[PDB]
Design a protein around this motif. Structure first.
Motif, mmCIF file in Angstrom:
data_model
loop_
_atom_site.group_PDB
_atom_site.id
_atom_site.type_symbol
_atom_site.label_atom_id
_atom_site.label_comp_id
_atom_site.label_asym_id
_atom_site.label_seq_id
_atom_site.Cartn_x
_atom_site.Cartn_y
_atom_site.Cartn_z
ATOM 1 N N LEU A 5 0.862 -1.181 0.000
ATOM 2 C CA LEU A 5 0.000 0.000 0.000
ATOM 3 C C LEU A 5 0.894 1.224 0.000
ATOM 4 C CD1 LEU A 5 -2.799 1.370 0.619
ATOM 5 C CD2 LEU A 5 -2.228 1.166 3.011
ATOM 6 N N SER A 6 0.625 2.189 -0.883
ATOM 7 C CA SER A 6 1.369 3.444 -0.908
ATOM 8 C C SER A 6 0.475 4.595 -0.475
ATOM 9 C CB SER A 6 1.904 3.752 -2.305
ATOM 10 O OG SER A 6 2.888 2.812 -2.679
ATOM 11 N N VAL A 7 1.020 5.498 0.331
ATOM 12 C CA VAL A 7 0.248 6.634 0.823
ATOM 13 C C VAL A 7 0.970 7.935 0.498
ATOM 14 C CG1 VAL A 7 -0.790 5.282 2.667
ATOM 15 C CG2 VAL A 7 1.238 6.606 3.171
ATOM 16 N N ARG A 12 -1.169 -8.361 5.580
ATOM 17 C CA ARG A 12 0.210 -8.222 6.017
ATOM 18 C C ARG A 12 1.062 -7.394 5.047
ATOM 19 N NH1 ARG A 12 2.490 -11.254 9.769
ATOM 20 N NH2 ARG A 12 4.264 -11.843 8.414
ATOM 21 N N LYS A 13 0.442 -6.743 4.055
ATOM 22 C CA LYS A 13 1.173 -5.898 3.116
ATOM 23 C C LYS A 13 1.955 -4.801 3.839
ATOM 24 C CE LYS A 13 -2.000 -6.167 -0.809
ATOM 25 N NZ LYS A 13 -2.957 -5.413 -1.657
ATOM 26 N N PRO A 14 3.130 -4.445 3.327
ATOM 27 C CA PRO A 14 3.817 -3.250 3.815
ATOM 28 C C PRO A 14 3.195 -1.969 3.286
ATOM 29 C CG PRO A 14 5.095 -4.272 2.065
ATOM 30 C CD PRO A 14 3.905 -5.169 2.305
ATOM 31 N N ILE A 15 3.552 -0.871 3.952
ATOM 32 C CA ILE A 15 3.176 0.479 3.547
ATOM 33 C C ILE A 15 4.413 1.214 3.070
ATOM 34 C CG2 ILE A 15 2.388 2.724 4.331
ATOM 35 C CD1 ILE A 15 0.758 1.112 6.462
ATOM 36 N N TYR A 16 4.314 1.846 1.899
ATOM 37 C CA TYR A 16 5.316 2.787 1.412
ATOM 38 C C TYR A 16 4.880 4.218 1.685
ATOM 39 C CZ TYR A 16 8.239 -0.405 -1.384
ATOM 40 O OH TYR A 16 9.080 -1.421 -1.809
ATOM 41 N N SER A 17 5.826 5.027 2.165
ATOM 42 C CA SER A 17 5.673 6.467 2.309
ATOM 43 C C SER A 17 6.979 7.071 1.823
ATOM 44 C CB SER A 17 5.499 6.838 3.775
ATOM 45 O OG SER A 17 5.634 8.228 3.978
ATOM 46 N N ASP A 18 6.917 8.270 1.234
ATOM 47 C CA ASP A 18 8.153 8.947 0.860
ATOM 48 C C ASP A 18 8.664 9.884 1.944
ATOM 49 O OD1 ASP A 18 6.755 11.397 0.557
ATOM 50 O OD2 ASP A 18 6.631 11.220 -1.614
ATOM 51 N N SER A 19 8.033 9.896 3.112
ATOM 52 C CA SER A 19 8.295 10.890 4.158
ATOM 53 C C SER A 19 9.206 10.302 5.232
ATOM 54 C CB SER A 19 6.982 11.359 4.766
ATOM 55 O OG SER A 19 7.224 12.276 5.836
ATOM 56 N N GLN A 20 10.486 10.655 5.172
ATOM 57 C CA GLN A 20 11.417 10.336 6.246
ATOM 58 C C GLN A 20 10.833 10.735 7.597
ATOM 59 O OE1 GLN A 20 15.616 12.439 7.219
ATOM 60 N NE2 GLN A 20 15.651 11.289 5.302
ATOM 61 N N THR A 21 10.232 11.921 7.663
ATOM 62 C CA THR A 21 9.723 12.441 8.930
ATOM 63 C C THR A 21 8.597 11.580 9.462
ATOM 64 O OG1 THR A 21 10.331 14.681 8.340
ATOM 65 C CG2 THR A 21 8.600 14.429 9.953
ATOM 66 N N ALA A 22 7.570 11.339 8.629
ATOM 67 C CA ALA A 22 6.386 10.627 9.100
ATOM 68 C C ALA A 22 6.723 9.193 9.459
ATOM 69 C CB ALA A 22 5.282 10.665 8.044
ATOM 70 N N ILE A 23 7.632 8.575 8.707
ATOM 71 C CA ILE A 23 8.050 7.214 9.032
ATOM 72 C C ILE A 23 8.641 7.169 10.430
ATOM 73 C CG2 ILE A 23 9.605 5.332 8.428
ATOM 74 C CD1 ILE A 23 9.156 6.169 5.479
ATOM 75 N N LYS A 24 9.500 8.139 10.763
ATOM 76 C CA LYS A 24 10.075 8.194 12.106
ATOM 77 C C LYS A 24 9.018 8.476 13.172
ATOM 78 C CE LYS A 24 13.592 10.403 14.958
ATOM 79 N NZ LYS A 24 12.714 10.700 16.131
ATOM 80 N N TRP A 25 8.107 9.418 12.910
ATOM 81 C CA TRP A 25 7.060 9.722 13.877
ATOM 82 C C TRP A 25 6.225 8.489 14.181
ATOM 83 C CZ3 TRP A 25 4.562 14.972 12.039
ATOM 84 C CH2 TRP A 25 5.492 16.011 12.244
#
Ligand code: K
Ligand code: K
Ligand code: MG
Ligand code: MG
Length: 135
Positions: A8-10, A66-79
């Motif tokens: 899933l990409s957001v 069980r799919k992974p999530i893709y985000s392009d946001s370094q910040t949001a991934i850390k949060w």
RNA sequence: ACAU
DNA sequence: CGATGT
């Protein structure tokens, strides 16, 4: 290295930053839009990126995926990893809605579990994330 | 600097 | 060009 297509990409979209914030989640393989949040009158890009990931976690958990999530946001991934959205956005009357949603997303993270891998979309190698707004 |  | 973030 390789895109995990079963995922899933957001992404967030905004009009101003801070400004009107929305987000959506798509099937990485097909681009099918799986959820879209109603625009929020004032928020930041990073709050929207954070809400998008958390909503993805909740969406996949509800569907036993069980799919992974893709985000392009370094910040949001850390949060999300920290379970804490360290936004600088002033808390006042006009930002109350976004801050309520962010507070509630943190609360959900602190009361639920998940194994969903949250992966960095490598925009430099792969182009724009499939959930991008093109704006 | 990197990610938006 | 400006703003949000680590
Ligand atoms: K865009
Ligand atoms: K900067
Ligand atoms: Mg993005
Ligand atoms: Mg985008």
């Amino acid at each position: 290295e390789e895109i995990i297509w079963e995922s899933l990409s957001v992404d967030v979209g905004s009009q101003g930053n801070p400004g009107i914030v929305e987000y959506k989640g798509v099937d990485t393989k097909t681009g099918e839009v799986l959820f879209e949040r109603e625009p929020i009158p004032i928020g930041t890009n990073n709050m929207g990126e954070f809400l998008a990931i958390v909503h993805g976690l909740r969406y996949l958990k509800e569907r036993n995926s069980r799919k992974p999530i893709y985000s392009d946001s370094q910040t949001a991934i850390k949060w999300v990893k920290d379970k804490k959205a360290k936004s600088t956005l002033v808390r006042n009357e006009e930002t109350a809605l976004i801050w309520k949603l962010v507070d509630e997303a943190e609360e959900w993270l602190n009361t639920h579990t998940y194994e969903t891998p949250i992966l960095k979309w490598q925009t430099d190698k792969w182009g724009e994330i499939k959930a991008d707004y093109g704006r």
